[PDB]
Amino acid sequence: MGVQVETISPGDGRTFPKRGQTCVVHYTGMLEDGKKFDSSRDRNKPFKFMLGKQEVIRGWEEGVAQMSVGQRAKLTISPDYAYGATGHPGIIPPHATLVFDVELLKLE
């Protein structure tokens, strides 16, 4: 599959990221089994990226673009939209479906 977005708490339902905007998020990244491999929350600092610059996996570019400011959503991303057949040795295994818990805090 592509990226599935499932809402946890709604956003304003009106402010959606456009290409070139900086998204400011908190996120927790887990393998399909639930093992957490990354989290901005555990660093106590939100994460920023610019939409459309491929600073993040494809599933993020496509999934966060469907969120409104303030929304918290569960994104499920297939390996082709993620780290693929190769994965990331020692962190993400081959052919891994990834689940992300993402809150879109604001746009800059």
**Strand proportion:** 35-45%
Find the count of extended strands (DSSP E, 2+ residues): 6
Using the coordinates shown, work out and report the CATH topology.
Answer: Chitinase A, domain 3
State the order of secondary-structure elements, H for helix, E for strand.
Answer: EEEEHEE
Note the gap between the termini: 30 Å
Which CATH C-level class is it? Alpha Beta
Helix percentage range: under 10%
- Second rung of CATH, namely the architecture: Roll
Overall, the morphology is globular
Please outline the major beta sheet: 6 strands, antiparallel
The figure for the number of domains is 1
Radius of gyration: 13 Å
Protein structure class: mainly beta
SS element count, helices? 1
Protein name: Peptidyl-prolyl cis-trans isomerase FKBP1A
Modified residues (N6-succinyllysine): 53
Catalytic activity: [protein]-peptidylproline (omega=180) = [protein]-peptidylproline (omega=0)
InterPro entries: FKBP-type_PPIase, PPIase_dom_sf, PPIase_FKBP_dom
Description:
InterPro entries: FKBP-type_PPIase (IPR050689), PPIase_dom_sf (IPR046357), PPIase_FKBP_dom (IPR001179). By secondary structure, this protein is mainly beta. The chain has one domain (2-108): Chitinase A, domain 3 (Roll), CATH 3.10.50.40. Helix content is 6%, strand content 38%. It is built from 1 helix and 6 strands, in the order E-E-E-E-H-E-E. The protein has one helix at 58-64; strands spanning 3-9, 22-31, 36-39, 47-50, 72-77, 98-107. Strands 1, 2, 3, 4, 5 and 6 form a 6-stranded antiparallel sheet that branches. Strand 2 and strand 3 form a beta hairpin. The longest helix is centred in the middle third of the chain and has 7 residues, at 58-64. It is globular and about 35 Å long.
